[PDB]
Each structure stands twice: as C-alpha cells, then as structure tokens.
Scaffold this active site. Structure first.
Site: not given
Ligand SMILES: CC(C)(O)[C@H]1CC[C@H](NC(=O)c2cnc3cc(N4CCC4)ncc3c2)CC1
Ligand SMILES: N[C@@H](CCC(=O)N[C@@H](CS)C(=O)NCC(=O)O)C(=O)O
Ligand SMILES: CC(C)(O)[C@H]1CC[C@H](NC(=O)c2cnc3cc(N4CCC4)ncc3c2)CC1
Lengths: 199, 199
Positions: A8, A14, A104
C-alpha cells in the site's frame, strides 16, 4: 503459518484495517509501503489497478474489506453467528460508503475543500447519530466482544477527526468505543509503532 | 422455513442481487417495492437511511452486499475455497465500487451528465478490459462454478449497457458470462417474471 506481504501507500488509508487484523491476531507479515511516485510503475502489475493487495504464498488478494473478511473468518474478530457477521458487514459497508464519498483524488484543491466541508458539516453529524443509536448501551458495535467493525470505526473516525476534530464532542459513547479499541494491547502496540502519516 | 421480506424501490437497483439469490436457492419471500413518494417517510424508519432492507422473522438487515453475503454464506454461490470466497468478495467490491462512482442521486442535472459520460467513456472500458483479463478463458469469474459474483457481473452490466450499448462490443467473453448467468434456469425464470423497470 503462511508468509504475508501487504502492499500500500505510506499512509493508513485502506490498508489500516488489514494491519489492525494482522496485529490483533499476532501474524508476522511484511508491510510494504510505496511512494506515490512508484505508483504508475506498480499499477499495471496490479490485477485491477487499485491498492492495497495482500500476497499469501505468491497469491495476490485485492480489495481491503475482502482481505479483512478473509483474514478474520473463523476468528473472534468475525462475529459469532451469520447474523452477527452480517451486522459486522453492514456497519463496515456503511462506514465505508461514507469514507468513499470524500473526493480524495480531486485535483482542484478548491473544489476538494467545498465537498469536504459539506460532508463534515451536513452528512457526518447525521451518521454519528446513527452509530450512537445503533450502539445503544453496548461496549462494542456487534455482539458482546470486539469485531473488526470496531477496528473500522476507530480507523475511519481517526481520519474523520483530523479534518473535523470536534466531530464526536456530543458522542462520548463513540469516543469510548475508539478508546476500547486503542486499549487492545496488540492494537495499542501497533498504534504506537506505526509510521506517523496524516491519512 | 424462515420468513423473508425485502423492501427497496420498484427497480432493479441495489436490491436485484438479493432477488437473484432468492431465485437461485428456491426461497419464498415477499418482494415489497416502495413508491418513490413514500421514500421521505420510510427513511426515518430505516436504520441508516438507505435501502434495501431485509426483514427476517422480526429482524431488520441493511446493506445489500452484507445481505447477499449472509444469504449465500453456506451455499455454493459463495465459492469453493476460502481463497476463492475472498476472490468472490473482491470482484463484487470491484464492481460495486464502480457502480458507486456514478451519481445516481445527484440533484443537479448538469453534474449528473458530465460524470456519467466521463465514467462510460474512460473508466468503464478500463474496467471491461481488466475483467475480461481476469476472466481469461475460464467459465465463471471465480473457480469452476457460478458464484454470486457472476450474478453481480450480470446485474451491473445490465445497468451499464443501458447507458453504453457499445460497452461490451469488444468483450464477447464477458457477454458469454452474461448469457451463461442468464440461462441458469432459476435465474432465467426471474428475469422473465420480474417487473420491467429501467434501472
Ligand atoms: C491519484 C493518487 C495520487 O494515486 C491517489 C489519490 C487518492 C489518495 N487516497 C487517499 O488519500 C485516501 C486516504 N485515506 C483514505 C481512508 C479511507 N478510509 C476507509 C477506511 C479509511 N478511504 C479512502 C482513503 C483515501 C491516494 C493517492
Ligand atoms: N476500495 C478498494 C480499492 C482501493 C483504492 O481504490 N485505493 C486507491 C488509493 S486508497 C488506489 O489504489 N488508487 C487511487 C484511486 O482509486 O482513486 C479497497 O478497499 O482496496
Ligand atoms: C430520487 C431518490 C429517491 O433520491 C433516489 C436517488 C438514487 C437513485 N438510485 C438509482 O436509481 C440507482 C439505480 N441503479 C443502481 C444500480 C446499482 N448497481 C450495483 C448493482 C447494480 N447500484 C446503485 C444504483 C442506484 C434512485 C432514486
């Protein structure tokens, strides 16, 4: 015991639910954290291009909640009946739908301010009242003992509190829940050990 | 025998997966459909304000995916191994995530169009490719027999094709999975007997 490799971002995000389950069950695993610069180079490798993934003996699992469910099956963390496991899943999904509403990925930091403020002002307070009613006079969200739903409450609220730090001021029962999870010696052990990130 | 009563809109929506599961298992239940007018009142009744709910002998369940997972727990829809059930959940979460991106409840019309278009033009093809790739030359998404993930694939794609008919034009292997799923006798009967709604 099988070998495990969690992959991750260097954030809680997540993957935190899986690290909580690992810690609670005393399962040595590898917590592989990437930089977002190393994300294009790895995305094509992934099954469906999203993170986290868990590797168990060369077999890649994806989708955090499915991995969480996989790792807790036949454990105390699961719930004791199919109805209790259903309630664990309903709560987890409910929390997760709300965590997912937040933009996000919205690049326009202005627009990400607006949506975030609205969800934390209008949406979230109603949800914190739904949890409070649901919990009632129980210590834990499901049954008479901790489940990974509680873990998830704590993980979600930790990240909701960073933005709206007064979110639980009228909900001390939901704060005590957070503390009951942070009181689990294995979980407390990992909350101190883990890398300090915003999200 | 146990008693089941399901409440959702008069549409496939997020209840249809439960209905598919009742058909396959030959389980008598009441398919209660609420008018869109009775929605504001019923919300107050609902636990966390969302439908579908499933009343079971005087107990209420929420969260369509948690409910489906409950009804399939001890059945063959659930997956042949512990790893495969993780994969069943993972495919369903991958598909539900994509369905959830869509702004089904967006009050502003212009916002609703820009996102739908956007998701059908760029996102949906990428997901179609990734699923096709995951399916490979196999018969079902997971293992060697039908799961409720296969049900979910047919349900989602039925809704997606309404907005993008050329969606699967380059993925005959995924169309074959639709047809295979649609031809399971218990299911085939339901598609024909269900109320013909748009979504
Ligand atoms: C485009 C990029 C740069 O590659 C990505 C953009 C989205 C970004 N994502 C977050 O910053 C983020 C942080 N914390 C989270 C917490 C949860 N929660 C459910 C249990 C906790 N869900 C979702 C979450 C998403 C990662 C990088
Ligand atoms: N929601 C699924 C997929 C997780 C997911 O979408 N992760 C994001 C960052 S937390 C990612 O890999 N790429 C960016 C996006 O999906 O917007 C999980 O809980 O594993
Ligand atoms: C006007 C109201 C009362 O406020 C409602 C707003 C929301 C709106 N929602 C939908 O119309 C809708 C339709 N189809 C769906 C299909 C799926 N899929 C996952 C497997 C299929 N998920 C979600 C779906 C939501 C209904 C009206």
């Amino acid at each position: 015991m099988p070998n495990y490799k969690l992959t991750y971002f260097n954030m809680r995000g997540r993957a935190e639910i899986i690290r909580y389950i690992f810690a609670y069950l005393d399962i040595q695993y590898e917590d592989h954290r990437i930089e977002q610069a190393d994300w294009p180079e790895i995305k094509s490798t992934l099954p469906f291009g999203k993170i986290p993934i868990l590797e168990v003996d060369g077999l890649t699992l994806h989708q955090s909640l499915a991995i969480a469910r996989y790792l807790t099956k036949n454990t105390d963390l699961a719930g004791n009946t199919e109805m209790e496991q259903c309630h664990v899943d309903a709560i987890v999904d409910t929390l997760d739908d709300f965590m997912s509403c937040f933009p996000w990925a919205e690049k326009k930091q202005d627009v990400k301010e607006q949506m975030f403020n609205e969800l934390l002002t209008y949406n979230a307070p109603h949800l914190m009242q739904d949890l409070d009613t649901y919990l009632g006079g129980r210590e834990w969200l499901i049954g008479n003992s901790v489940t990974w739903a509680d873990f998830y409450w704590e993980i979600c609220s930790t990240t909701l509190l960073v933005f709206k730090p007064d979110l639980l001021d009228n909900h001390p029962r939901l704060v005590t829940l957070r503390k009951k999870v942070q009181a689990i010696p294995a979980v407390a052990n990992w909350i101190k050990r883990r890398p300090q990130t915003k999200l």
